Curated annotation (Swiss-Prot), chains A, C:
The protein's name in its UniProt record: Lon protease homolog, mitochondrial
Cell compartments where the protein resides: Mitochondrion matrix
Chain's role: ATP-dependent serine protease that mediates the selective degradation of misfolded, unassembled or oxidatively damaged polypeptides as well as certain short-lived regulatory proteins in the mitochondrial matrix. Endogenous substrates include mitochondrial steroidogenic acute regulatory (StAR) protein, DELE1, helicase Twinkle (TWNK) and the large ribosomal subunit protein MRPL32/bL32m. MRPL32/bL32m is protected from degradation by LONP1 when it is bound to a nucleic acid (RNA), but TWNK is not. May also have a chaperone function in the assembly of inner membrane protein complexes.
Family, per entry: Belongs to the peptidase S16 family.
Comment block on domains: The Lon N-terminal domains are crucial for the overall structure of the protein, maintaining it in a conformation allowing its proper functioning.
Disease listed for this protein: CODAS syndrome: A rare syndrome characterized by the combination of cerebral, ocular, dental, auricular, and skeletal features. These include developmental delay, craniofacial anomalies, cataracts, ptosis, median nasal groove, delayed tooth eruption, hearing loss, short stature, delayed epiphyseal ossification, metaphyseal hip dysplasia, and vertebral coronal clefts.
Designated gene of the protein: LONP1
Species in which this protein is naturally found: Homo sapiens (Human)
Subunit organization: Homohexamer. Organized in a ring with a central cavity. The ATP-binding and proteolytic domains (AP-domain) form a hexameric chamber, while the N-terminal domain is arranged as a trimer of dimers. DNA and RNA binding is stimulated by substrate and inhibited by ATP binding. Interacts with TWNK and mitochondrial DNA polymerase subunit POLG.
Expression sites by tissue: Duodenum, heart, lung and liver, but not thymus.
Entire-sequence positions represented here: 415 to 463 of 959
Curated annotation (Swiss-Prot), chain B:
Cell compartment(s), UniProt: Mitochondrion matrix
Signal peptide residue numbers: none
Name recorded for this polypeptide: Lon protease homolog, mitochondrial
Coiled coil: none
Family: Belongs to the peptidase S16 family.
Tissue: Duodenum, heart, lung and liver, but not thymus.
Function statement: ATP-dependent serine protease that mediates the selective degradation of misfolded, unassembled or oxidatively damaged polypeptides as well as certain short-lived regulatory proteins in the mitochondrial matrix. Endogenous substrates include mitochondrial steroidogenic acute regulatory (StAR) protein, DELE1, helicase Twinkle (TWNK) and the large ribosomal subunit protein MRPL32/bL32m. MRPL32/bL32m is protected from degradation by LONP1 when it is bound to a nucleic acid (RNA), but TWNK is not. May also have a chaperone function in the assembly of inner membrane protein complexes.
Subunit details: Homohexamer. Organized in a ring with a central cavity. The ATP-binding and proteolytic domains (AP-domain) form a hexameric chamber, while the N-terminal domain is arranged as a trimer of dimers. DNA and RNA binding is stimulated by substrate and inhibited by ATP binding. Interacts with TWNK and mitochondrial DNA polymerase subunit POLG.
Notes on the domains: The Lon N-terminal domains are crucial for the overall structure of the protein, maintaining it in a conformation allowing its proper functioning.
Organism from which the protein derives: Homo sapiens (Human)
Disease: CODAS syndrome: A rare syndrome characterized by the combination of cerebral, ocular, dental, auricular, and skeletal features. These include developmental delay, craniofacial anomalies, cataracts, ptosis, median nasal groove, delayed tooth eruption, hearing loss, short stature, delayed epiphyseal ossification, metaphyseal hip dysplasia, and vertebral coronal clefts.
Length: 49, 48, 49
């Protein structure tokens, strides 16, 4: 959650659209469901950044 | 996608169905004229 | 089972076809065999959702 929360305070400053809000948040939910080791998770991690 | 590929998520239609919560919405396909008919798999067959 | 139970009351309102009924039933049992923490359990969890 460290990456997620530095990006979350990021998110807290800039006023994201609610569409993009739910997208970043559900992508964050998929980060949480995706295992850390997967290269698929590395792709979504790079995507989140 | 098949759900066997890594990261697969359901096609757009299921998402609209998930959102509108009705069995009988009013889908509005847009801009049929410019659908991409390429070597990479023609969607226009998929629309039929 | 808590997740499957909110799912099953869900299904108790809307009337599913018996086809997809049996499919969700076998997937529900297949979920129930699956570990509470396995990555594939999270996949089938999100899928059953």
């Amino acid at each position: 959650d460290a990456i997620e929360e530095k990006f979350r305070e990021r998110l807290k400053e800039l006023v994201v659209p609610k569409h993009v809000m739910d997208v970043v948040d559900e992508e964050l939910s998929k980060l949480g469901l995706l295992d850390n080791h997967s290269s698929e998770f590395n792709v979504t991690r790079n995507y989140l950044d | 996608h098949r759900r066997t590929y890594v990261g697969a998520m359901p096609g757009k239609i299921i998402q609209c169905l998930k959102k509108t919560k009705t069995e009988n919405p009013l889908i509005l396909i847009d801009e049929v004229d410019k659908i991409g008919r390429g070597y990479q798999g023609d969607p226009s067959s998929a629309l039929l």
